[PDB]
Design a protein around this nucleic acid. Structure first.
Lengths: 408, 121, 228, 36, 191, 143
RNA sequence: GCGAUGAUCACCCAUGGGUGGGUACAAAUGGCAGUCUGACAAGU
């Protein structure tokens, strides 16, 4: 008789006495939980299913639910006679393999737990048979994949990756700033008036890439970088400049630096666009409401998206200016009312006391939208709740604006 | 839907809403999702009542986390407009918090409802 | 400034410094898994809180034989967000392994995060009533501990131990009358559950009430023997 | 100056200095005993 | 005689190396979110970035992959086989191809930055031999540059007296003797 | 003198400090430890010292009960008067936070009651024979 | 086979280790450190 067992690396089959129940009785009664009995009955047929994590997860999901094509290609040649009896643990798998095409007899979760227990006990002794390794870390990997599938982690919904993105973005802003300042200074030995007249880091570096020395600039155009007046201005300064003459080794290395500057700027805008796309994927309603950037700032400030959901509305209203918050609470002045939301589009659209009121109502509506997007076990990702909350808050904003103050 | 899991039947809803109005009258009740979360944070809540037909359900569904984290009983009731009547305000309310105060006349009621809520949990 | 002394259980320690502490070792240095304060003396140590882990409270109350030795395999039922199974995996260390089981999804995600951090802990988000279902993955944990809040604690422990536990194994259960009966005296309840386990072939050895750190809470330790 | 003697305020660095502290406490003692 | 180039080049070498550190750590972090035991196996961060740039996704692993990542530095420490099985059976969560392109672009960015550092360091060496060759041949180009940066200018260094340059048992003897000879060299190279 | 917002802030600081102190401290255990033994003769002969293979102190004090085989605080200055003194200062510090917190809670409660009474109502002032002042507001739905 | 182009000038165990202090860089779910109010308002 055959017995089937499931291993993290493969599917195993062992042949034994057809009187399997009586064999189990002998096992448990004589304490045959040892290498003696398992060398008596080592293996019948093994199959190590391929090392593809998707194949692993799907095959085990099928083990949980139904019968696999791997199972078919294993059970193609179990039998010698038309009738063979196979031990299986799962009852649903038992009746499924009853209904399958070969139609050999099978037995469900009988007293054969003795067999399963002992063959797992000296499965380490079975490892020299087919799987010459330690299955522990195999099981770790498979379990993590299975848990991922069971919880249904969409590859896009990872708040921690969002915090990574925003922190990296801030750091990129700081370091691009310091590099641009350094390059402006180092080129200052050659064209200080330009350093003063233009302020854009990218514009400066592209200038260094296009022109190299002042009259070369006088003869070269800069239309696609700067407008006409600014490029003629740098023309005049090039005529009357106070910098030295530069060797081409120096010029080469300063040019390489400016190239690094523009490549960083291109990367930074690219990564910001990435962050836009990813947040639209994750929490679309909040993005629809307040805006992708301030949504990122909100999630970052709270840490977890879930904890940000847990926070009440007022904390979302004043999530940023906590320093002034607590200082004013302690010193009995009046608390701040904007915090981090102040950079939201609608609160920017409002004016003064209208800014305060729209801030409050936007805080509450955003709290609602945030909770829905975070805890929606299923979610359309369209952002329809965001659109409706936005419509409501816009009506509120128009009402406040049309609410005049002076008696006409 | 099992997301709003503990949903009171008619009788338990009656006694819940009655003690809710009592507490609204003696002013031991905080009305609204946000203020309820605030009481929950401060640990001053005797228990939590929620609506079950909110549009949608998650906006208050956030609460059971903090509730059963801090061991504060919570229960759902069928209609938010009914809950608004029970609270005694002009607008439908979706979630209210019965606070805790030793110097309350409704002590024994709140404790009976909280008893039955815990049994149901 | 802090003296470290070994507790009677291999893997746990007591710190005698400005304050006393009950502590374990660490495998993720400089990373507290749920906010508890760590110390170093150097080698990294991490404190338990008895109020937050029933195992911690039981150890603090004193136990004769806790069957989690470092070089072992330990199964955990009811790893609610994993705050305690982190400490258990710390006790076990790299030599052994810990198989945790959870059902409700949010603690499932938390425990997936923690099990991504640590390799000794392994996640089973599958339902605990169906060892038939999650029989794929883990093989015969050496000792079994349960914190499940469900009324059929003995039933589910019986299934798990029958299907998986090594014979002469150790089993530890956390039990609370406020959830099982909640209207009848706690010691009577504990008599009822110990009778259930003796029926289900678990020979009890000890049980402790944890009343300084948790009201109406018992922990029972017994041996699994004469079984297959 | 130092890294650990860097205090965020002139008052607290005045505290950190020690000779000042003993002179101040002394002087305050005798001025109080003359007041009393 | 201009040397503000030397000052700036030192500012760059230092800050740039710090930033190389930071961004290599970031790439370690992200490709650990995808596949962490590689980040544990290979600590050399530049090789880590190039290895990511090669194996974008952990799925791609064959024997030709084995050989090519063996050409990536070597096999002598079993890196090839160890990463192969670790990635075949990794517990690494999978993420979007957008994330893969992001991480690969970032690793490319760091690699270019490091190559820039090498170029700049050779620049500094030859510029020193241009400007202050005697001081360089005495102490070493990098350290001489650090001296000049501390002083503020070659002129400030040379104008500086011997003991102040020093602050700028036989260990003390040799240190002070070196300071004297260094100051003399700075004078010669400045004037 | 002070404002309700400041009082609320101070009380919440004290709550967080108190929970931190409780996290860092512990309490001595006192459980109802019950042993299961098989035969009546073994129970009659049972002694905790042998069943736990400990000594007198090791069995009287609970948390860490060693075996004699395993057996097979003077490092600090003035161990017998300084370390225990620090122990008690930590304990009384926790208790001081506790009682200042409860005083602040009482003050905040009184301030809130006064503020609400000024806030609204169709109020009636009722005095209870324990001398205590309450206000019963008439039953009116608030619009 | 010298020198102004520079001579000379905190603890413990026996030139070995431990304790401390100084400078740079990095990490922290370390600390400081607590997340506003809660029902009316706008027109007639």
């Amino acid at each position: 008789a055959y017995v089937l067992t499931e291993t993290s690396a493969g599917y195993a089959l062992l042949k034994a006495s057809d009187k399997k129940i009586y064999k189990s009785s002998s096992l448990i009664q004589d304490l045959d939980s040892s290498d003696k009995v398992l060398k008596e009955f080592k293996i019948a047929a093994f199959s190590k299913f391929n090392s593809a994590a998707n194949a692993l997860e799907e095959a085990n999901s099928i083990i949980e639910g139904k019968v696999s094509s791997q199972l078919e290609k294993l059970l193609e040649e179990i039998k010698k006679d038309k009738k063979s009896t196979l031990i299986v643990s799962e009852t649903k798998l038992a009746n499924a393999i009853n209904k399958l095409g070969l139609n050999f007899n099978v037995v469900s979760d009988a007293v054969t737990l003795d067999i399963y227990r002992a063959i797992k006990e000296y499965l380490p002794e079975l490892l020299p048979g087919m799987s010459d390794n330690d299955l522990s870390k195999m099981s770790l990997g498979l379990a993590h994949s299975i848990g991922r599938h069971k919880l249904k982690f969409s590859a896009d919904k990872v708040d921690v990756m969002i915090i990574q993105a925003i922190a990296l973005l801030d750091d990129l802003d700081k370091e691009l700033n310091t590099y641009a300042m350094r390059c402006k200074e180092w080129y200052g030995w050659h064209f200080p008036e330009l350093a003063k007249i233009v302020t854009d880091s990218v514009a400066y570096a592209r200038i260094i890439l296009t022109m190299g020395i002042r009259s070369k600039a006088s003869e070269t155009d800069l239309s696609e970088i700067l407008p006409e007046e600014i490029e003629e201005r740098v023309k005049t300064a090039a005529e009357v400049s106070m910098g030295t003459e530069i060797t081409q080794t120096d010029l080469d290395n300063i040019n390489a630096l400016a190239e690094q500057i523009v490549e960083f700027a291109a990367y930074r805008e690219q990564l910001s666009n990435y962050l836009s796309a990813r947040m639209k994927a994750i929490a679309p309603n909040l993005t629809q409401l307040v805006g992708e950037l301030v949504g990122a700032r909100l999630i970052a400030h709270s840490g977890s998206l879930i904890s940000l959901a847990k926070s009440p509305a007022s904390t979302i209203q004043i999530l940023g200016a906590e320093k002034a918050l607590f200082r004013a609470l302690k010193t009995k002045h009046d608390t701040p009312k904007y915090g981090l939301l102040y950079h939201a589009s609608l609160v920017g659209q409002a004016t003064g006391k209208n800014k305060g009121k729209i801030a409050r109502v936007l805080a509450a509506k955003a709290a609602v939208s945030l909770r829905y997007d975070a805890l929606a076990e299923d979610r359309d990702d369209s952002g329809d709740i965001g659109l409706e909350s936005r419509a409501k808050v816009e009506n509120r904003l128009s009402q406040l604006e049309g609410r005049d103050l002076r008696t006409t | 839907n099992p997301k709003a899991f503990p949903l009171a039947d008619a009788a338990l809803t009656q006694q819940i809403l009655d003690v809710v109005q009592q507490a609204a009258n003696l002013r031991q009740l905080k009305k609204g999702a946000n203020e309820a979360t605030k009481t929950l944070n401060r640990g001053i809540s005797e228990f939590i009542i929620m609506a079950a037909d909110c549009e949608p359900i998650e906006i208050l569904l956030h609460l059971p986390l903090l509730c059963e984290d801090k061991n504060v009983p919570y229960v759902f009731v069928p209609s938010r407009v009914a809950l608004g009547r029970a609270c005694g305000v002009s607008r439908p309310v979706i979630a209210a918090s019965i606070t805790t105060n030793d110097a309350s006349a409704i002590k024994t009621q709140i404790y009976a409802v909280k008893d039955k809520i815990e049994t149901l949990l | 400034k802090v003296v470290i002394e070994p507790h009677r259980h291999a893997g746990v320690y007591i710190a005698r410094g400005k304050e006393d502490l009950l502590v374990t070792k660490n495998m993720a240095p400089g990373e507290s898994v749920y906010g508890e304060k760590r110390i170093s003396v150097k080698v990294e140590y991490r404190v338990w809180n008895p109020f937050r882990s029933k195992l911690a409270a039981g150890i603090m109350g004193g136990l004769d034989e806790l069957f989690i030795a470092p070089g072992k395999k330990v199964l955990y039922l009811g790893a609610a967000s994993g705050t305690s199974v982190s400490h258990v995996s710390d006790v076990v260390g790299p030599e052994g392994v810990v198989y945790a089981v959870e059902f409700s999804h949010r603690p499932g995600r938390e425990l997936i995060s923690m099990a991504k951090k640590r390799p000794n802990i392994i996640p089973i988000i599958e339902d605990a009533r169906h060892p038939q279902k999650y029989r794929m993955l883990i093989g015969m944990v050496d000792c079994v501990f349960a914190d499940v809040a469900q009324p059929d604690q003995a039933r589910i422990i019986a299934l798990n131990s029958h299907m998986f536990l090594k014979d002469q194994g150790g089993v530890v259960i956390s039990i609370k009358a406020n959830c099982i009966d909640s209207t009848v005296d706690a010691e009577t309840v504990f008599a009822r559950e110990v009778q259930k386990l003796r029926e289900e072939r678990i020979k009890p050895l000890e049980q402790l009430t944890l009343e300084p750190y948790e009201r109406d809470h018992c922990i029972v330790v017994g041996r699994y023997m004469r079984s297959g | 100056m130092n890294r650990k003697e860097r205090k965020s305020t002139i008052l607290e660095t005045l505290m950190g200095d020690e000779a000042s502290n003993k002179y101040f406490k002394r002087k305050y003692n005798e001025i109080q005993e003359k007041s009393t | 005689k201009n040397d503000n180039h030397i000052i700036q080049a030192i500012a760059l070498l230092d800050q740039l190396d710090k930033d190389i550190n930071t961004f290599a750590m970031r790439v370690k972090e992200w490709y650990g979110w995808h596949f962490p035991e590689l980040a544990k196996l290979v600590p050399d961060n530049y090789t880590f970035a190039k290895l990511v740039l090669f194996i974008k996704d952990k799925a791609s692993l064959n024997d030709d992959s084995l050989h090519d990542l063996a050409a990536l530095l070597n096999e002598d420490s079993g890196i090839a086989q160890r990463v192969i099985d670790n990635a075949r059976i990794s517990m690494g969560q999978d993420i979007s191809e957008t994330d893969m392109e992001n991480v690969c672009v970032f690793a490319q960015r760091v690699a270019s930055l490091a190559d820039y550092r090498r170029q700049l360091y050779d620049y500094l060496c030859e510029k020193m031999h241009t400007v202050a060759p005697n001081l360089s041949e005495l102490i070493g180009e990098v350290i001489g540059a650090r001296l000049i940066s501390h002083a503020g200018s070659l002129t400030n260094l040379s104008k500086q007296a011997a003991s102040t340059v020093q602050i700028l048992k036989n260990k003390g003897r040799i240190s002070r003797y070196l300071a004297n000879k260094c100051s003399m060299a700075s004078r010669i190279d400045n004037y | 003198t002070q404002d309700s917002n400041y009082v609320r802030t101070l009380r919440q600081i004290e709550l967080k400090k108190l929970e931190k102190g409780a996290k860092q401290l512990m309490f001595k255990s006192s459980g109802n430890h019950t042993i299961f033994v098989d035969s009546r003769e073994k129970m009659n002969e049972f002694t905790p010292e042998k069943f736990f293979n400990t000594t007198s102190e090791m069995v009287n004090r609970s948390e860490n009960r060693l075996t004699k085989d395993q057996l097979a605080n003077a490092s600090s200055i003035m161990p017998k008067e300084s370390l225990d003194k620090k122990k008690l200062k930590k304990f009384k510090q926790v208790k001081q936070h506790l009682q200042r917190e409860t005083q602040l809670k009482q003050v905040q409660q009184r301030m809130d009651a006064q503020r609400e009474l000024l806030k609204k109502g169709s109020k009636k002032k009722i005095v209870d024979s324990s001398g205590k002042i309450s206000f019963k507001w008439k039953k009116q739905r608030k619009r």
